[PDB]
Structure 1
Amino acid sequence: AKEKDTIRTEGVVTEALPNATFRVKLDSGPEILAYISGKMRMHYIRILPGDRVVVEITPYDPTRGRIVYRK
């Protein structure tokens, strides 16, 4: 099925944590742990610690999000 309570809000890469991990601060309100989307990692697309990025956030855990749009 796949519910639809997902979101695409944007933000900026803050920290450059380990294993394709980032502090990404949502333009919206705060920042989340944000991990690099599979797609994106498969197509490489390095991601500097200060880029505007798109996030996929499950209301289930706003605290986390996946980076969708590369830059």
Structure 2
Amino acid sequence: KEDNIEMQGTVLETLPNTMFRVELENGHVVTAHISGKMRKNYIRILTGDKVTVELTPYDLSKGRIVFRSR
């Protein structure tokens, strides 16, 4: 959390367990899982959207989605 990393990306394909494959503005692909409120707000994500992706410096291969472009 300290010194967080903030990026956008595009979701490419659906995975089981509501996890997702997202290409990143820098060319990298990451594995993403949903946050609580867009889970609590019943907001479902489809293929192809632009999404805001939080990253952590410990590992950049997997991130978390926090905001989807409708």
TM-score, with normalisation over the residues of structure 1?
Answer: 0.87
**Which letter does structure 1 place at the counterpart of 2:2?**
E
Q: Tell me the number of residue pairs that the alignment of Structure 1 and Structure 2 aligns.
A: 69
Shift of 1:50: 1.0
Shift of 1:48: 0.3
Which residue number in structure 2 is paired with residue 38 of structure 1? 36
Shift of 1:20: 1.2
Write the distance in 2 (CA, Å) between the matches of 1:44 and 1:27. 27
Shift of 1:70: 2.0
Shift of 1:19: 1.5
**Which letter does structure 1 place at the counterpart of 2:59?**
D
Instruction: State the 4+ residue runs in structure 1 displaced beyond 6 angstroms.
Output: none
* Structure 1 unaligned regions, length at least 5: none
Matches within 5 A, 1:1-71: 2-4=1-3, 6-71=4-69
Identity %: 58
Q: Deviations over 1:34-55 (max 9, x none)?
A: 1111221111211001110000
Write the distance in 2 (CA, Å) between the matches of 1:28 and 1:40. 25
Contact 1:12 1:24 in 2 (8 A): yes
